[PDB]
Amino acid sequence: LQCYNCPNPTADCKTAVNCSSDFDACLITKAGLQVYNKCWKFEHCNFNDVTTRLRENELTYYCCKKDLCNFNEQLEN
């Protein structure tokens, strides 16, 4: 499963790396203009396992399971 991984939560990342390693749900949390491109598990994909791990709250963590399903056009449109 591919996913966009970056060193910082930018709103225009274009990195493509093979997640794997206990990863089955890509995570695209967009808290407005800032975006969070990081891999995430499907068990910790809820309104508390993600907003707590990153210590965030307002956002729409969207977990998926496709190759590179975390691009700048998933939650929007």
Coordinates of all heavy atoms in Angstrom, one line a residue:
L1 N 0.9 -1.2 0.0 CA 0.0 0.0 0.0 C 0.9 1.3 0.0 O 1.7 1.4 0.9 CB -0.9 0.0 1.2 CG -2.3 0.4 0.9 CD1 -3.3 -0.4 1.6 CD2 -2.5 1.9 1.3
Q2 N 0.7 2.1 -1.0 CA 1.5 3.3 -1.0 C 0.9 4.4 -0.2 O -0.3 4.4 0.1 CB 1.7 3.8 -2.5 CG 2.7 2.9 -3.2 CD 2.1 2.6 -4.6 OE1 2.3 3.4 -5.5 NE2 1.5 1.5 -4.8
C3 N 1.6 5.4 0.2 CA 1.0 6.5 1.0 C 2.0 7.8 0.9 O 3.2 7.6 0.7 CB 0.9 6.1 2.4 SG -0.7 5.3 2.6
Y4 N 1.4 8.9 1.1 CA 2.3 10.2 1.1 C 2.9 10.4 2.5 O 2.2 10.7 3.4 CB 1.5 11.3 0.7 CG 1.0 11.2 -0.8 CD1 -0.1 10.4 -1.0 CD2 1.7 11.7 -1.8 CE1 -0.5 10.2 -2.4 CE2 1.3 11.6 -3.1 CZ 0.2 10.8 -3.4 OH -0.2 10.6 -4.7
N5 N 4.2 10.3 2.6 CA 4.8 10.5 4.0 C 5.7 11.8 3.9 O 6.4 12.0 2.9 CB 5.7 9.3 4.4 CG 6.2 9.5 5.8 OD1 5.5 10.1 6.6 ND2 7.4 9.1 6.1
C6 N 5.6 12.6 4.9 CA 6.4 13.9 4.9 C 6.9 14.2 6.3 O 6.4 13.7 7.2 CB 5.5 15.1 4.4 SG 4.5 14.5 3.0
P7 N 8.0 15.0 6.3 CA 8.6 15.3 7.6 C 7.8 16.4 8.3 O 7.9 16.7 9.5 CB 10.0 15.9 7.2 CG 9.8 16.3 5.7 CD 8.6 15.6 5.1
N8 N 6.9 17.0 7.6 CA 6.0 18.1 8.2 C 4.7 18.1 7.6 O 4.5 17.7 6.5 CB 6.7 19.5 8.0 CG 7.4 19.9 9.3 OD1 7.1 19.4 10.4 ND2 8.4 20.7 9.2
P9 N 3.7 18.6 8.3 CA 2.3 18.6 7.8 C 2.1 19.8 6.9 O 1.7 20.9 7.2 CB 1.5 18.9 9.1 CG 2.5 19.5 10.2 CD 3.9 19.1 9.7
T10 N 2.5 19.6 5.6 CA 2.4 20.7 4.6 C 1.1 20.5 3.9 O 0.5 19.4 3.8 CB 3.6 20.6 3.7 OG1 3.4 21.7 2.7 CG2 3.6 19.3 3.0
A11 N 0.6 21.5 3.2 CA -0.7 21.4 2.4 C -0.4 21.3 1.0 O -1.0 21.8 0.1 CB -1.6 22.6 2.7
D12 N 0.7 20.6 0.6 CA 1.1 20.4 -0.8 C 2.2 19.4 -0.9 O 3.1 19.5 -1.7 CB 1.6 21.8 -1.4 CG 2.5 22.4 -0.4 OD1 3.2 21.7 0.4 OD2 2.6 23.6 -0.4
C13 N 2.2 18.4 -0.1 CA 3.3 17.4 -0.1 C 3.1 16.5 -1.3 O 2.0 16.3 -1.8 CB 3.2 16.5 1.2 SG 4.8 15.9 1.6
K14 N 4.2 15.9 -1.8 CA 4.1 15.1 -3.1 C 5.0 13.9 -2.9 O 5.5 13.3 -3.9 CB 4.5 15.9 -4.3 CG 3.3 15.9 -5.3 CD 2.9 17.4 -5.5 CE 3.4 17.8 -6.9 NZ 2.5 18.9 -7.4
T15 N 5.2 13.5 -1.7 CA 6.2 12.3 -1.5 C 5.4 11.0 -1.6 O 4.2 10.9 -1.1 CB 6.8 12.4 -0.1 OG1 7.7 13.4 0.0 CG2 7.4 11.1 0.3
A16 N 6.0 10.0 -2.2 CA 5.3 8.7 -2.3 C 6.2 7.6 -1.8 O 7.2 7.2 -2.4 CB 4.9 8.4 -3.8
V17 N 5.8 7.0 -0.7 CA 6.7 5.9 -0.1 C 5.8 4.7 0.2 O 4.6 4.8 0.5 CB 7.3 6.4 1.2 CG1 8.0 5.3 1.9 CG2 8.4 7.5 0.9
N18 N 6.4 3.5 0.2 CA 5.6 2.3 0.5 C 5.4 2.2 2.1 O 6.4 2.0 2.8 CB 6.4 1.1 0.0 CG 6.8 1.3 -1.4 OD1 6.2 0.9 -2.3 ND2 7.9 2.0 -1.7
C19 N 4.2 2.3 2.5 CA 3.9 2.3 4.0 C 4.3 0.9 4.5 O 5.4 0.6 4.9 CB 2.5 2.5 4.2 SG 2.2 4.2 4.8
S20 N 3.4 0.0 4.5 CA 3.7 -1.4 5.1 C 4.2 -1.3 6.5 O 4.2 -0.2 7.1 CB 4.7 -2.1 4.2 OG 4.1 -2.8 3.2
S21 N 4.6 -2.4 7.1 CA 5.1 -2.3 8.5 C 3.9 -2.0 9.5 O 3.9 -1.0 10.2 CB 6.1 -1.1 8.6 OG 6.7 -0.9 7.3
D22 N 3.0 -2.9 9.5 CA 1.8 -2.7 10.5 C 1.0 -1.5 10.0 O 0.4 -0.7 10.8 CB 2.3 -2.4 11.9 CG 2.1 -3.6 12.7 OD1 2.6 -4.7 12.5 OD2 1.3 -3.5 13.7
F23 N 0.9 -1.3 8.7 CA 0.1 -0.1 8.2 C -1.0 -0.6 7.2 O -0.6 -1.3 6.2 CB 1.0 0.9 7.5 CG 1.9 1.5 8.5 CD1 3.2 2.0 8.1 CD2 1.5 1.7 9.9 CE1 4.0 2.5 9.1 CE2 2.4 2.3 10.8 CZ 3.6 2.7 10.4
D24 N -2.2 -0.4 7.4 CA -3.3 -0.8 6.5 C -4.3 0.3 6.2 O -5.2 0.1 5.4 CB -4.0 -2.0 7.1 CG -3.3 -3.3 6.8 OD1 -2.1 -3.4 6.9 OD2 -4.0 -4.3 6.3
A25 N -4.1 1.4 6.8 CA -5.1 2.5 6.5 C -4.4 3.9 6.4 O -3.9 4.4 7.3 CB -6.1 2.6 7.6
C26 N -4.3 4.4 5.2 CA -3.6 5.7 5.0 C -4.3 6.7 5.8 O -5.5 6.6 6.0 CB -3.5 6.0 3.5 SG -2.0 6.8 3.1
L27 N -3.7 7.8 6.2 CA -4.4 8.8 6.9 C -4.2 10.2 6.3 O -3.1 10.7 6.2 CB -3.9 8.8 8.4 CG -4.6 10.0 9.2 CD1 -5.8 9.4 9.9 CD2 -3.6 10.6 10.2
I28 N -5.3 10.9 6.0 CA -5.2 12.2 5.4 C -6.1 13.2 6.3 O -7.2 13.4 6.1 CB -5.8 12.2 4.0 CG1 -5.9 13.7 3.5 CG2 -7.1 11.5 4.0 CD1 -6.6 13.7 2.1
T29 N -5.5 13.7 7.3 CA -6.2 14.6 8.3 C -6.1 16.0 7.8 O -5.0 16.6 7.9 CB -5.7 14.4 9.7 OG1 -6.2 13.2 10.2 CG2 -6.1 15.6 10.6
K30 N -7.1 16.7 7.4 CA -7.0 18.1 6.9 C -7.7 19.0 7.9 O -8.9 19.1 8.0 CB -7.7 18.2 5.6 CG -7.7 19.7 5.1 CD -7.8 19.8 3.6 CE -9.3 19.8 3.3 NZ -9.9 21.2 3.3
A31 N -7.0 19.6 8.8 CA -7.6 20.5 9.8 C -7.8 21.9 9.2 O -7.5 22.9 9.9 CB -6.7 20.6 11.0
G32 N -8.3 22.0 8.0 CA -8.4 23.4 7.4 C -7.4 23.6 6.3 O -7.5 23.0 5.2
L33 N -6.4 24.4 6.5 CA -5.4 24.6 5.4 C -4.2 23.7 5.7 O -3.6 23.3 4.7 CB -4.9 26.1 5.5 CG -4.2 26.3 6.8 CD1 -2.7 26.2 6.5 CD2 -4.5 27.7 7.3
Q34 N -4.0 23.3 6.9 CA -2.8 22.4 7.2 C -3.3 21.0 6.9 O -4.3 20.6 7.3 CB -2.4 22.6 8.7 CG -3.6 22.2 9.6 CD -3.6 23.2 10.7 OE1 -4.2 24.3 10.6 NE2 -3.0 22.9 11.9
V35 N -2.4 20.2 6.3 CA -2.8 18.8 6.0 C -1.8 17.9 6.7 O -0.6 18.2 6.9 CB -2.7 18.6 4.5 CG1 -3.1 17.1 4.2 CG2 -3.6 19.5 3.8
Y36 N -2.2 16.7 7.1 CA -1.3 15.7 7.8 C -1.2 14.5 7.0 O -2.1 13.6 6.9 CB -1.9 15.4 9.2 CG -1.8 16.6 10.0 CD1 -2.8 17.6 10.0 CD2 -0.7 16.7 10.9 CE1 -2.7 18.7 10.8 CE2 -0.6 17.9 11.8 CZ -1.6 18.9 11.7 OH -1.5 20.0 12.5
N37 N -0.1 14.3 6.3 CA 0.1 13.1 5.4 C 0.9 12.0 6.2 O 2.1 12.1 6.3 CB 0.9 13.4 4.2 CG 0.2 14.6 3.5 OD1 0.7 15.7 3.4 ND2 -1.0 14.4 2.9
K38 N 0.2 11.1 6.8 CA 0.9 10.1 7.6 C 0.2 8.7 7.6 O -1.0 8.7 7.3 CB 1.0 10.5 9.1 CG 2.2 11.4 9.3 CD 2.5 11.7 10.8 CE 1.9 13.0 11.2 NZ 2.9 13.9 11.8
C39 N 0.9 7.7 7.7 CA 0.3 6.3 7.7 C -0.5 6.1 9.0 O -0.1 6.6 10.0 CB 1.3 5.2 7.5 SG 0.8 4.1 6.2
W40 N -1.5 5.3 9.0 CA -2.3 5.1 10.2 C -2.9 3.7 10.2 O -3.2 3.1 9.1 CB -3.3 6.2 10.4 CG -3.6 6.4 11.8 CD1 -4.3 5.7 12.6 CD2 -3.0 7.5 12.6 NE1 -4.3 6.2 13.9 CE2 -3.5 7.4 13.9 CE3 -2.2 8.6 12.4 CZ2 -3.2 8.3 15.0 CZ3 -1.9 9.5 13.4 CH2 -2.4 9.3 14.7
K41 N -3.2 3.1 11.3 CA -3.8 1.8 11.4 C -5.4 2.0 11.3 O -5.9 3.0 11.5 CB -3.5 1.1 12.7 CG -2.1 1.6 13.2 CD -1.6 0.7 14.3 CE -1.0 -0.6 13.7 NZ -0.7 -1.6 14.8
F42 N -6.1 0.9 10.9 CA -7.5 1.0 10.8 C -8.2 0.9 12.2 O -9.3 1.3 12.4 CB -8.1 -0.1 9.9 CG -9.5 0.2 9.5 CD1 -9.7 0.7 8.2 CD2 -10.5 -0.1 10.3 CE1 -11.0 1.0 7.8 CE2 -11.8 0.2 9.9 CZ -12.1 0.8 8.7
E43 N -7.5 0.3 13.1 CA -8.0 0.2 14.5 C -7.9 1.5 15.2 O -8.7 1.9 16.1 CB -7.2 -0.9 15.3 CG -8.2 -1.6 16.2 CD -7.6 -3.0 16.5 OE1 -6.4 -3.1 16.7 OE2 -8.4 -4.0 16.5
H44 N -6.9 2.3 14.9 CA -6.7 3.6 15.6 C -7.3 4.7 14.7 O -7.0 5.9 14.9 CB -5.2 3.9 15.8 CG -4.7 2.9 16.8 ND1 -3.5 3.1 17.5 CD2 -5.2 1.7 17.3 CE1 -3.3 2.0 18.3 NE2 -4.3 1.1 18.2
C45 N -8.1 4.3 13.7 CA -8.7 5.4 12.8 C -10.1 5.8 13.4 O -11.1 5.3 12.9 CB -8.9 4.8 11.4 SG -7.4 5.2 10.4
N46 N -10.2 6.7 14.3 CA -11.5 7.1 14.9 C -11.4 8.5 15.4 O -10.3 9.1 15.3 CB -11.9 6.1 16.0 CG -11.5 4.7 15.6 OD1 -12.3 3.9 15.3 ND2 -10.2 4.4 15.7
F47 N -12.4 9.0 16.0 CA -12.4 10.4 16.5 C -11.8 10.4 18.0 O -12.5 10.7 18.9 CB -13.8 11.0 16.6 CG -13.9 12.2 15.7 CD1 -14.6 12.3 14.6 CD2 -13.2 13.4 16.2 CE1 -14.6 13.5 13.8 CE2 -13.2 14.5 15.4 CZ -13.9 14.6 14.2
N48 N -10.6 10.0 18.1 CA -10.0 9.9 19.5 C -8.6 9.3 19.4 O -7.7 9.6 20.1 CB -10.9 9.1 20.4 CG -11.4 10.0 21.5 OD1 -12.5 10.4 21.5 ND2 -10.6 10.3 22.5
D49 N -8.5 8.3 18.5 CA -7.2 7.6 18.4 C -6.2 8.4 17.5 O -5.0 8.4 17.6 CB -7.4 6.2 17.7 CG -7.2 5.1 18.8 OD1 -6.5 5.4 19.8 OD2 -7.7 4.0 18.6
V50 N -6.8 9.3 16.7 CA -5.9 10.1 15.8 C -5.8 11.5 16.4 O -4.8 12.1 16.6 CB -6.5 10.2 14.4 CG1 -5.8 11.3 13.6 CG2 -6.4 8.9 13.7
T51 N -7.0 12.1 16.8 CA -6.9 13.5 17.4 C -6.2 13.4 18.7 O -5.9 14.4 19.3 CB -8.4 14.0 17.6 OG1 -9.2 12.8 17.6 CG2 -8.8 14.9 16.5
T52 N -5.9 12.3 19.2 CA -5.2 12.1 20.5 C -3.7 11.9 20.2 O -2.8 12.4 20.9 CB -5.8 11.0 21.3 OG1 -7.1 11.3 21.7 CG2 -5.0 10.8 22.6
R53 N -3.4 11.0 19.3 CA -2.0 10.7 19.0 C -1.3 12.0 18.6 O -0.2 12.3 19.0 CB -2.0 9.7 17.8 CG -1.7 8.3 18.4 CD -0.2 8.1 18.7 NE 0.4 7.5 17.4 CZ 1.2 6.4 17.5 NH1 2.3 6.5 18.2 NH2 0.8 5.3 17.0
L54 N -1.9 12.7 17.7 CA -1.3 14.0 17.2 C -1.7 15.1 18.2 O -1.3 16.3 18.1 CB -1.8 14.4 15.9 CG -1.9 13.1 15.0 CD1 -2.9 13.2 13.9 CD2 -0.5 12.9 14.3
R55 N -2.5 14.8 19.2 CA -2.9 15.9 20.2 C -3.8 16.9 19.5 O -3.7 18.1 19.8 CB -1.7 16.5 20.8 CG -1.4 15.9 22.1 CD 0.0 16.3 22.7 NE 0.2 15.8 24.0 CZ 1.4 15.4 24.4 NH1 2.2 16.3 24.9 NH2 1.8 14.2 24.4
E56 N -4.5 16.6 18.5 CA -5.4 17.5 17.7 C -6.8 17.3 18.1 O -7.1 16.5 19.0 CB -5.2 17.4 16.2 CG -5.5 18.7 15.5 CD -4.5 18.8 14.3 OE1 -3.7 18.0 14.2 OE2 -4.6 19.8 13.6
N57 N -7.7 18.0 17.5 CA -9.2 17.8 17.8 C -10.0 18.1 16.6 O -10.6 17.2 16.0 CB -9.6 18.7 18.9 CG -10.6 18.0 19.8 OD1 -11.6 18.6 20.2 ND2 -10.3 16.8 20.2
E58 N -10.1 19.4 16.2 CA -10.9 19.7 15.0 C -10.2 19.2 13.7 O -9.1 19.6 13.4 CB -11.1 21.3 14.9 CG -12.3 21.7 15.8 CD -12.4 23.2 15.7 OE1 -11.8 23.8 14.9 OE2 -13.2 23.7 16.5
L59 N -10.9 18.5 12.9 CA -10.3 18.0 11.7 C -11.2 16.9 11.1 O -12.2 16.5 11.6 CB -8.9 17.4 12.0 CG -8.9 16.5 13.2 CD1 -8.9 15.0 12.8 CD2 -7.7 16.8 14.1
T60 N -10.8 16.3 10.0 CA -11.6 15.2 9.4 C -10.7 14.0 8.9 O -10.6 13.6 7.8 CB -12.3 15.7 8.1 OG1 -12.6 17.1 8.3 CG2 -13.6 15.0 7.9
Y61 N -10.0 13.5 9.9 CA -9.1 12.3 9.5 C -9.8 11.4 8.6 O -10.8 10.7 9.0 CB -8.7 11.6 10.8 CG -9.9 10.9 11.4 CD1 -9.9 9.5 11.3 CD2 -10.9 11.6 12.0 CE1 -11.0 8.8 11.8 CE2 -12.1 10.9 12.5 CZ -12.1 9.5 12.4 OH -13.2 8.8 12.9
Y62 N -9.3 11.2 7.4 CA -10.0 10.3 6.4 C -9.1 9.1 6.2 O -8.0 9.2 5.5 CB -10.3 11.0 5.1 CG -11.0 10.1 4.2 CD1 -12.4 10.2 4.1 CD2 -10.3 9.1 3.5 CE1 -13.1 9.3 3.2 CE2 -11.0 8.3 2.6 CZ -12.4 8.4 2.5 OH -13.1 7.5 1.6
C63 N -9.4 7.9 6.7 CA -8.5 6.8 6.5 C -9.0 6.0 5.3 O -10.1 5.9 5.0 CB -8.7 5.8 7.7 SG -8.1 6.7 9.2
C64 N -8.0 5.5 4.5 CA -8.4 4.8 3.3 C -7.5 3.5 3.2 O -6.7 3.2 4.0 CB -8.1 5.7 2.1 SG -6.7 6.7 2.3
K65 N -7.6 2.8 2.1 CA -6.8 1.5 2.0 C -6.4 1.4 0.5 O -6.2 0.2 0.0 CB -7.6 0.3 2.4 CG -8.0 0.5 3.8 CD -9.1 -0.5 4.2 CE -8.5 -1.8 4.6 NZ -7.9 -2.5 3.4
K66 N -6.2 2.4 -0.2 CA -5.8 2.3 -1.7 C -4.4 2.8 -1.8 O -3.8 3.4 -0.9 CB -6.7 3.1 -2.5 CG -8.2 2.9 -2.1 CD -9.1 3.2 -3.3 CE -8.8 2.3 -4.5 NZ -10.1 1.9 -5.1
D67 N -3.8 2.6 -3.0 CA -2.4 3.0 -3.2 C -2.4 4.6 -3.4 O -2.9 5.1 -4.3 CB -1.8 2.4 -4.5 CG -2.5 3.0 -5.7 OD1 -3.7 3.1 -5.7 OD2 -1.8 3.4 -6.6
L68 N -1.7 5.3 -2.4 CA -1.7 6.7 -2.5 C -3.1 7.3 -2.5 O -3.5 8.1 -3.3 CB -1.0 7.1 -3.9 CG 0.4 6.5 -3.9 CD1 1.0 6.8 -5.3 CD2 1.3 7.2 -2.9
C69 N -3.8 6.9 -1.5 CA -5.2 7.5 -1.4 C -5.2 8.8 -0.5 O -6.2 9.3 -0.2 CB -6.1 6.5 -0.6 SG -5.3 6.0 0.9
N70 N -4.0 9.3 -0.2 CA -3.9 10.5 0.5 C -3.4 11.7 -0.3 O -2.3 12.1 -0.1 CB -3.0 10.3 1.7 CG -2.9 11.6 2.5 OD1 -3.1 12.7 2.0 ND2 -2.6 11.5 3.8
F71 N -4.2 12.1 -1.3 CA -3.7 13.2 -2.1 C -4.5 14.5 -1.8 O -5.3 14.5 -1.0 CB -3.9 12.9 -3.6 CG -5.2 12.2 -3.8 CD1 -6.3 12.9 -4.2 CD2 -5.4 10.8 -3.5 CE1 -7.6 12.3 -4.4 CE2 -6.6 10.2 -3.7 CZ -7.7 11.0 -4.1
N72 N -4.2 15.6 -2.5 CA -5.0 16.8 -2.3 C -6.2 16.8 -3.1 O -6.5 17.7 -3.9 CB -4.1 18.0 -2.7 CG -4.4 19.2 -1.8 OD1 -3.6 19.5 -0.8 ND2 -5.5 19.9 -2.0
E73 N -7.1 15.9 -2.8 CA -8.4 15.8 -3.6 C -9.2 14.7 -3.1 O -10.0 14.0 -3.9 CB -8.1 15.7 -5.1 CG -8.7 16.9 -5.9 CD -9.5 16.4 -7.0 OE1 -9.4 15.2 -7.3 OE2 -10.3 17.1 -7.6
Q74 N -9.1 14.4 -1.8 CA -9.9 13.2 -1.3 C -11.1 13.8 -0.5 O -12.3 13.5 -0.9 CB -9.1 12.4 -0.4 CG -9.8 11.1 0.1 CD -9.3 9.9 -0.7 OE1 -8.4 10.0 -1.4 NE2 -10.0 8.8 -0.5
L75 N -10.9 14.5 0.6 CA -12.0 15.0 1.4 C -12.8 16.1 0.5 O -14.0 16.2 0.6 CB -11.5 15.6 2.6 CG -11.0 14.5 3.6 CD1 -9.6 14.9 4.1 CD2 -12.0 14.4 4.8
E76 N -12.0 16.8 -0.2 CA -12.7 17.9 -1.1 C -13.2 17.3 -2.3 O -12.7 16.3 -2.9 CB -11.7 19.0 -1.4 CG -11.4 19.9 -0.2 CD -10.0 20.5 -0.3 OE1 -9.2 19.8 -0.9 OE2 -9.8 21.5 0.2
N77 N -14.3 17.8 -2.8 CA -14.9 17.2 -4.1 C -15.5 15.8 -3.8 O -15.3 15.3 -2.6 CB -13.9 17.1 -5.1 CG -13.0 18.3 -5.1 OD1 -13.4 19.4 -5.3 ND2 -11.7 18.2 -4.8

